[PDB]
């Protein structure tokens, strides 16, 4: 088409981006909490039946050995965005033989979202991303928005009850947390809105520390759930 489908409304707002935000807010809950020694990205991975093999489509995906990424919104849009983020990280490594800094990766994913907001025949991505990373010797948690705007967060939540999750994180969160404690906080925040018994499979969590980002296995998530019950 070549004509942008995201245009300013008579009130100076991009209604297309607002509707993408609504689609995101209608997505599955997800929480990201950065501790003193790492970050945790937890998310609701509830299926609609036990037929769904909850081991093939992963809600939390790694993009580099020190960067992981979870989302809230459209699964297919998340897939394309994670693929693009992986490609951007590989290009950065190839140019500079050094793992891409988390800030740069979120910047480039945000640029991709912005150019899909601006381009002609396309639609804004209906996902909000929650990149986590351990570049340098510091943990980074970034939220990237369908508008292409990225915010650094100490801890945040996005999904169905994201306002309630953010209030809960404000009450429960402190700068002195430690990774195994931030995991507890993240699972507790997810439980704050979870509708039903929280099994070790219908939830997914991924940590990111000095060793590198890794998606906790259902066994470890089960142990955390048992400690949190």
């Amino acid at each position: 088409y070549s004509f942008s489908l995201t245009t300013f409304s008579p009130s100076g707002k991009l209604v297309q981006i607002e509707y993408a935000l609504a689609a995101v807010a209608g997505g599955a809950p997800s929480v990201g909490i950065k501790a003193a020694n790492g970050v945790v990205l937890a998310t609701e991975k509830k299926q609609k039946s036990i037929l769904y093999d909850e081991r093939s489509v992963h809600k939390v995906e790694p993009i580099t050995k020190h960067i992981g990424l979870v989302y809230s919104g459209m699964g297919p849009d998340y897939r394309v965005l994670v693929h693009r983020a992986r490609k951007l990280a590989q290009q950065y490594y190839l140019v500079y033989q050094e793992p891409i800094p988390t800030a740069q990766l979120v910047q480039r994913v945000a640029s991709v979202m912005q150019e899909y907001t601006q381009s002609g025949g396309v639609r804004p991505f209906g996902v909000s991303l929650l990149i986590c990373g351990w570049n340098e010797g510091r943990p980074y948690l970034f939220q990237s928005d369908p508008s292409g705007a990225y915010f650094a967060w100490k801890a945040t939540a996005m999904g169905k009850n994201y306002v309630n999750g953010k209030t809960f994180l404000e009450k429960r969160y402190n700068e002195d947390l430690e990774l195994e404690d931030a995991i507890h906080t993240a699972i507790l925040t997810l439980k704050e809105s979870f509708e039903g018994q929280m099994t070790e499979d219908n939830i997914e969590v991924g940590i990111c520390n000095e060793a590198g980002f890794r998606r906790l296995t259902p066994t470890e998530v089960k142990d955390y759930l048992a400690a949190i019950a």
Binding site: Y1, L5, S9, G12, G120, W153, T156
Partner: protein, 254 residues
């Protein structure tokens, strides 16, 4: 002949570009930013819309970016459009540096970015960049300079100006109490503080709600420094003292 076209780059029954002006009013809704020129240097204050408590501080700035050695800008409007525009500004400045082996003049960089803005407002069906820029820079032609560019691709050189929320009130105040061949950085900071106070009356100018960046010259080099929380708190305290003194004087007179 498309049904979905939306005709971004057409004129209106009157010669008024609807998308460009909707972008202008998006700027107006966006956060406030202002800049002040002064014989010793230039400064740029900016309200912060990231005042959430759970929001980390990872960059040296959020509204303010550095374009090259002796030049910074501040964005009002849409953050992603602002990011792409700042990247393009850096590219333009570094291309000029590669080509001529000297820093790009501020007016030249502003004109280049505004040429891109005008291209987006005239060509294609793409919506314009809903971003307004305030550039503060130094060059060997006119020294310290302040420019303000709008989504339409129009830029103007100012001694003091404001964009964003309540920008009209801020510019009116600056017009009232700005001195042309005077007002070194100290008084410029004080004026910016008072303008931000009367522009964000809702909040009593908490030091964490604003960001100030000062560009000056030292030993032939250009230094662009973001005022620390300590300095911002000192400035706010000084303004509060001055305001209390003025109120006391008025009441005593009455």
């Amino acid at each position: 002949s498309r049904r979905y076209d939306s005709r971004t780059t057409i004129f209106s029954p009157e010669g008024r570009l609807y998308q460009v002006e909707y972008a202008m009013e998006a700027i107006g809704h966006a956060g406030t930013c202002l800049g002040i020129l002064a014989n010793d240097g230039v400064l740029l204050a900016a309200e912060r819309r990231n005042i959430h408590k759970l929001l980390d501080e990872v960059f040296f700035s959020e509204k303010i970016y550095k374009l090259n050695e002796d030049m910074a800008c501040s964005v009002a409007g849409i953050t992603s459009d602002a990011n792409v525009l700042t990247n393009e500004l850096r590219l333009i400045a570094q291309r000029y540096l590669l080509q001529y082996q000297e820093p790009i003049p501020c007016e030249q960089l502003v004109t280049a970015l505004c040429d891109i803005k005008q291209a987006y407002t005239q060509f294609g069906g793409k919506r314009p960049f809903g971003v307004s820029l305030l550039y503060i820079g130094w060059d060997k032609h006119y020294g310290f300079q302040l420019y303000q560019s709008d989504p339409s691709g129009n830029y103007g050189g100012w001694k003091a100006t404001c964009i964003g929320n309540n920008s009209a009130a801020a510019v009116s105040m600056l017009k009232q109490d700005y001195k042309e061949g005077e007002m070194t950085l100290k008084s410029a900071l004080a004026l910016a503080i008072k303008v931000l106070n009367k522009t964000m009356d809702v909040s009593k100018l908490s030091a964490e709600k604003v960001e100030i960046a000062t560009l000056t010259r030292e030993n032939g080099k250009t230094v662009i420094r973001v005022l620390k929380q300590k300095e911002v708190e000192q400035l706010i305290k000084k303004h509060e003292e001055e305001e209390a003194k003025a109120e006391r004087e008025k009441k005593e007179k009455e």
